Design a binder for this molecule. Structure first.
Ligand SMILES: NC(=O)c1cnc(C(F)(F)F)nc1
Length: 152
């Protein structure tokens, strides 16, 4: 049947919100009050892929935009990008692998691993107003843990 999707926001474990930073760029910053309207709302689709109790394959599209987070090699490195798609054809249950993240629940937090690039994760910096990026460890100074908020 159709693909099932939920509207949501994400915040990193330091409670930074995600906003735009150009036509295809996301940054993370501390946000509260009026400025919270600036945060990106995702449509999280539950897609085809290997699945277990705590590891759920999803795609992350921007709400009512034909833009998806994707993982590709750029200048020979696994990188995160926002990629446009044909709005007639998306979302779909069989999303291409570059669009698929494994949403992993550990200790009441979420990690989003690239399905395409094992052990590469959606990451934020500790500094304010820096890009969201794909980081090659769920270790170290960069942040790989998030919480989800459900949106109407
Ligand atoms: N400048 C970056 O490292 C960067 C990568 N990826 C993104 C995305 F896809 F979240 F929007 N925004 C910025």
């Amino acid at each position: 049947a159709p693909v099932r999707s939920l509207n949501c926001t994400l915040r990193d474990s330091q409670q930074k919100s995600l906003v735009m930073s150009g036509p295809y760029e996301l940054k993370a910053l501390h946000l509260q009050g009026q400025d919270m309207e600036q945060q990106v709302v995702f449509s999280m689709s539950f897609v085809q892929g290997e699945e277990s109790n705590d590891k759920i394959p999803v795609a992350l599209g921007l709400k009512e935009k034909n833009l998806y987070l994707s993982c590709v090699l750029k200048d020979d490195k696994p990188t995160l990008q926002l990629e446009s798609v044909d709005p007639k054809n998306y979302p779909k249950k069989k999303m291409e692998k570059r669009f698929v993240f494994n949403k992993i629940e550990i200790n009441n937090k979420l990690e989003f691993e690239s399905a395409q690039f094992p052990n590469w994760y959606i990451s934020t910096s500790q500094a304010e107003n820096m890009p969201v990026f794909l980081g090659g460890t769920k270790g170290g100074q960069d942040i790989t843990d998030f919480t989800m908020q459900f949106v109407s």
